[PDB]
């Protein structure tokens, strides 16, 4: 019987993206080939099975830098990071395979399923 | 023209609450009278003008403990912290004044407005 605020979760996410844009309380750098991306571990964990698995382990929880597999496309990663923080996925003809393969690696199954739909629709 | 995931922001928040429940990557303790509450600064900042104002200041950004005003009701605070992480506000007859006053102090204006509505409805 609690009162539901229907825009609250979305508003929080938007504010978290604003903090990311200002580098406030970011606690990890993700290195992908020649590029680097700063983020909040908590958001990464909430959105990715790979990052969840990494940072839940006490051995790896305080890591400040994560080097991704060198074969991962930085653009694919950037699209998915933007999705994590915005709920909006920038899927396009020229990026679909890179985004799909990166989502598989990051263990983002709902996103992988959505890419299967984009392929199907052409 | 991006693809909108309508449950993503909500799912993230839920996962963040799960991390809080497990004390994973919490980075602050909020002390309110005799009680203490652990949280993620980023979520606090996203949800409260008081916490935003505190942690944006470089002088205060690395604080690991925040002592709230001793007059603040811990139950009022707990209700609002639960709201921050769930989007669901536990407003009741026996708690409305405490929650409203705590929301004013925490600078949560939409919540204060909602409390004005509960009072009106009785
Ligand atoms: O669920 C997530 C992360 N996540 C987001 C999407 C997504 C996915 O598609 N596959 C996986 N596989 C790994 C896995 C992790 C957890 C439970 C089952 C499971 F199979 N994980 C994903 N994080 C989370 C869960 C619970 N409590 C707190 C947090 Cl932060
Ligand atoms: O907006 C918030 C926090 N917040 C949530 C509810 C709420 C409120 O009712 N009143 C206030 N007053 C202070 C204030 C802060 C910022 C802008 C205007 C402003 F008046 N702040 C609130 N945080 C945020 C904003 C932007 N970028 C990143 C983050 Cl994390
Ligand atoms: Cl910082
Ligand atoms: Cl931790």
User: Which residue(s) pair with B65 in the sheet?
Assistant: B29
CB under 8 Å to B93, separation ≥6 — which residues?
Answer: none
Record: contact B19-A87, CB cut-off 8 A: no
Nearest to A26 by CA among B59, B45, B50, B29: B45
User: Rounded CA gap, A111 and A50, in Å?
Assistant: 14
Nearest to B76 by CA among B55, B52, B57, B104: B104
User: Which residue in B5, B7, B9 has the most chain A C-beta atoms within 10 A of its own C-beta, making it the best mutation to test that interface?
Assistant: B9
CB under 8 Å to A84, separation ≥6 — which residues?
Answer: A39, A43, A44, A46, A47, A48, B12
Within 10 A of B23 (CB to CB), how many other CB atoms are there?
8
Query: Where do the structural domains in chain B lie, given as residue ranges?
Result: 1-122
C-alpha A53 chain-centroid distance: 14
Record: contact A91-B2, CB cut-off 8 A: yes
User: Rounded CA gap, B83 and B93, in Å?
Assistant: 17
User: Rounded CA gap, B46 and B107, in Å?
Assistant: 11
User: Over the range A22-60, which residues count as b (16 or more CB within 10 Å of their CB) and which as e?
Assistant: eebbbbbebebeeeebebbbbbbbbbbebbbebbeeeee
User: Rounded CA gap, B106 and B44, in Å?
Assistant: 10
| A17 three-state secondary structure | helix
Technique behind the model: X-ray
User: Rounded CA gap, B119 and A11, in Å?
Assistant: 25
**DSSP 8-class letter at B67:** E
| A69 three-state secondary structure | coil
Within 10 A of B48 (CB to CB), how many other CB atoms are there?
21
What sign for the dihedral angle of Cα A49, A51, A56, A57?
positive
Nearest atom of ligand 2 to the alpha carbon of B42: 30
User: Rounded CA gap, B99 and A29, in Å?
Assistant: 38
Quick check: A40 and A19 in contact, CB under 8 A? Answer: yes
Q: How far is the CA of A46 from the centre of ligand 1 (A)?
A: 7
User: Rounded CA gap, A45 and A6, in Å?
Assistant: 23
A13: its two tokens: 């996410």
Contacts of B89 in chain A (CB under 8 A): 2-3, 5
User: Rounded CA gap, A26 and B47, in Å?
Assistant: 17
* Resolution of the structure in the document, Å: 1.5
Within 10 A of B80 (CB to CB), how many other CB atoms are there?
22
Quick check: A17 and A84 in contact, CB under 8 A? Answer: no
A8 interfacial to chain B (CB closer than 8 Å): yes
Q: How far is B9 from chain A (nearest CA, A)?
A: 5
| A95 three-state secondary structure | coil
B120: its two tokens: 């009106």
Provide, for chain A, the percentages of residues in helix, strand and coil under a 3-state DSSP scheme, each rounded to the nearest 5. Answer: 55, 15, 35
């Amino acid at each position: 019987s609690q009162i539901q605020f229907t825009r609250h979760a979305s508003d929080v996410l938007l504010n978290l993206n604003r903090l990311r844009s200002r580098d406030i309380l970011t606690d990890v750098v993700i290195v992908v080939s020649r590029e680097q991306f700063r983020a909040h571990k908590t958001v990464l964990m909430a959105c990715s099975g790979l990052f969840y698995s990494i940072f839940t382990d006490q051995l790896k929880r305080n890591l400040s830098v994560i080097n991704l597999d060198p074969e991962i496309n930085p653009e694919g990663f950037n699209i998915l990071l933007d999705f994590m923080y915005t709920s909006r996925l920038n899927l396009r003809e020229g990026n679909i395979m890179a985004v799909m393969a990166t989502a598989m690696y990051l263990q983002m199954e709902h996103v992988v399923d959505t890419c299967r739909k984009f392929i199907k629709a052409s």
